[PDB]
Amino acid sequence: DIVMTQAAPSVPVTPGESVSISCRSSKSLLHSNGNTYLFWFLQRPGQSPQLLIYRMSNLASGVPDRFSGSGSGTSFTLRISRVEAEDVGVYYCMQHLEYPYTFGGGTKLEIKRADAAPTVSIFPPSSEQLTSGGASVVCFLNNFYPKDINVKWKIDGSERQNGVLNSWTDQDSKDSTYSMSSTLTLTKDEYERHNSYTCEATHKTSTSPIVKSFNR
Amino acid sequence: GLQSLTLDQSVRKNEKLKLAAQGAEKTYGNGDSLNTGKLKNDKVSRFDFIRQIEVDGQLITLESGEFQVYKQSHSALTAFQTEQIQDSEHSGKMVAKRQFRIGDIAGEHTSFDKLPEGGRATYRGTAFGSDDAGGKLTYTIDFAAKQGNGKIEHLKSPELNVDLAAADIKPDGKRHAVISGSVLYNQAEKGSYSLGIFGGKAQEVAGSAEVKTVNGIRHIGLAAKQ
């Protein structure tokens, strides 16, 4: 088979700037008919890959003027001229010169935004959940830059460390922010067995830990 | 000579045939007329061609190459020298691929029921195949016997210089006078041929031959006149 080498697993770029993502084939992708059989796609998390470039340089219909593609025969480059927040994703290169069609490993386009502060929100277990037998105290530390953040849970004052899950967001396609959710789960009785519950967010932007609590 | 030629086999129902020469280009559809009047008689005229169709709003080129027209006074024929073609079959790419095939054989067909009732007529003209329009066609028809025979000479490929074996004149589906026979190479069968008789006084013949060679079946365009 023909191998597509996308060296960089990721590529940093700041908004308004210029980026380049390089691909590499194990064979000249230029056909004797003159056409170079190379595609470029973008795949945003939870979505199907979208076409950007066909025939190595041509821009697929509905793709911003921003985008462009060039190449030698074994070396190809995708170029975004003035990078917007919505370009955040994974760029795959694909050859369709000969069967089997092969893709590049991928290159994650990471945006380098200016450090942002979380907007921490706390919610007590649902009235619906409690009647089901459980109790999930959820906390949302949203729209912060960068990804490096840690959360703590205080039950009446005592540290809560076991039975809590943290889900992290992929870089936001509107503001290039990051977000995450913390979920302390207990039983119906265990939760009612205490009064105060709080969230302790620790981020680079604030030395003084970020707190949000509720009392019954 | 023949002033117009109707393109039928040369451009199918949902195709467009773009012809270009000396900077000008015109597009034809099935049933459209080709102005052969402007072309030189007894010679092959060449055009660049692109055969196209439209798929869900986009125009697609199926094949391209050279389109050839041979003009007589009462008959004419077209042929295609493919150079590039769509391989919609396997690698959906436009692939360099050369093939030669006859398009339309047209003109004023002589009726089988209005042929000369006797005498012997000799026809002299051209045999043309892939990359070679220098062949000479000689054909003789005996109108008393209603039989014809001939030969192809002066083609660069030796296996294409064949005998057009004696065959009967017969009426076709439209009662046009046609001769369909066997092709011989050094007296042995190597293919088939068919010629129509054209002109009010059976002035001309036009048609084609298919010859088996070591390189595959080759097509030869044929046209001769008294």
Contacts of A31 (CB under 8 A, 6+ apart): A37, A97, B93
Q: Is the peptide bond before A100 cis (omega within 30 degrees of 0)?
A: yes
Fold of B1-110: Immunoglobulin-like (2.60.40)
- The number of C-alpha atoms within 13 Å of A62 and in the hemisphere containing its C-beta is 2
Domain B111-226 part of CATH 2.40.160.90? yes
How many residues appear in chain B? Answer: 226
Alpha carbon distance B37, B193 (integer Å): 27
Nearest Cα of chain B lies from the Cα of A66 at a distance, in angstroms, of 25
How many residues appear in chain A? Answer: 216
Buried-exposed string B149-181: b where 16+ CB fall within 10 A, e elsewhere: bbbbeebebebbbbbbbebebeeeeeebbbbeb
Candidates A31, A35, A39: best to mutate against B (most CBs of B within 10 A) is A31
Amino acid (1-letter code) at residue B189? E
Alpha carbon distance B201, A25 (integer Å): 68
Decide if B35 contacts B4 (C-beta within 8 A).
Answer: yes
Element (DSSP H or E) covering residue B118: none
Place of tokens 């050369």: B98
Q: What residue segments make up the domains of chain B, in order of their start?
A: 1-110, 111-226
| Angle at the Cα of B225 from the Cα atoms of B221 and B226, rounded to 5 degrees | 155
CA-nearest residue of chain A to B96? A33
Amino acid (1-letter code) at residue A179? S
Under DSSP, the state recorded for B160 is G
Decide if B205 contacts B194 (C-beta within 8 A).
Answer: no
| Phi, psi for residue A88 in degrees, rounded to 5 | -60, 130
Contacts of B182 (CB under 8 A, 6+ apart): B165, B167, B189, B191, B192, B193
Q: What residue segments make up the domains of chain A, in order of their start?
A: 1-113, 114-216
Beta bridge partners of B212: B217
Buried-exposed string A144-163: b where 16+ CB fall within 10 A, e elsewhere: bbbeebebbbebeeeebeee
Alpha carbon distance A201, A210 (integer Å): 5
Alpha carbon distance B104, B17 (integer Å): 14
Neighbour-count burial of A125, counting CB atoms closer than 10 A to its CB (0-12 exposed, 13-18 middle, 19+ buried):
buried
Both tokens assigned to A156: 């009446």
What are the distances in angstroms from CA A210 to CA A34, A117, B77, B203?
60, 10, 88, 104
Contacts of B158 (CB under 8 A, 6+ apart): none
Q: Are strands B177-185 and A19-24 parallel, antiparallel or unpaired?
A: unpaired
Q: What residues in B contact A35, CB-CB < 8 Å?
A: 93-94
Decide if A73 contacts A36 (C-beta within 8 A).
Answer: yes
> CB A208: neighbour CB atoms within 10 A?
6
Percent of chain B that is helix, strand, coil (3-state, to 5)? 5, 65, 30
Decide if A24 contacts A94 (C-beta within 8 A).
Answer: no
Amino acid (1-letter code) at residue B134? G
Alpha carbon distance A146, B44 (integer Å): 75
Fold of A114-216: Immunoglobulin-like (2.60.40)
Nearest Cα of chain B lies from the Cα of A16 at a distance, in angstroms, of 35
B93, A31: Cβ pair inside 8 Å? yes
Nearest Cα of chain A lies from the Cα of B66 at a distance, in angstroms, of 17
A33, B91: Cβ pair inside 8 Å? no
Place of tokens 């109108």: B143
Element (DSSP H or E) covering residue A143: strand A134-144
Same fold, B1-110 and B111-226: no
Place of tokens 């009967």: B168
Alpha carbon distance B44, B79 (integer Å): 10
- Nearest alpha carbon to residue B79 among B5, B3, B170, B174: B5
Contacts of B101 (CB under 8 A, 6+ apart): B79, B80, B82, B219
Decide if B226 contacts B119 (C-beta within 8 A).
Answer: no
Fold of A1-113: Immunoglobulin-like (2.60.40)
B61 at A interface, C-beta within 8 A: no
Give me the resolution in angstroms, 1 decimal: 3.0
Same fold, A1-113 and A114-216: yes
For A86-138, the DSSP string reads GG-EEEEEEE-SSSSPEEB--EEEEE----B--EEEEEPPPHHHHTTTEEEEE
CA A76, chain centre distance (Å)? 25
> CB B92: neighbour CB atoms within 10 A?
10
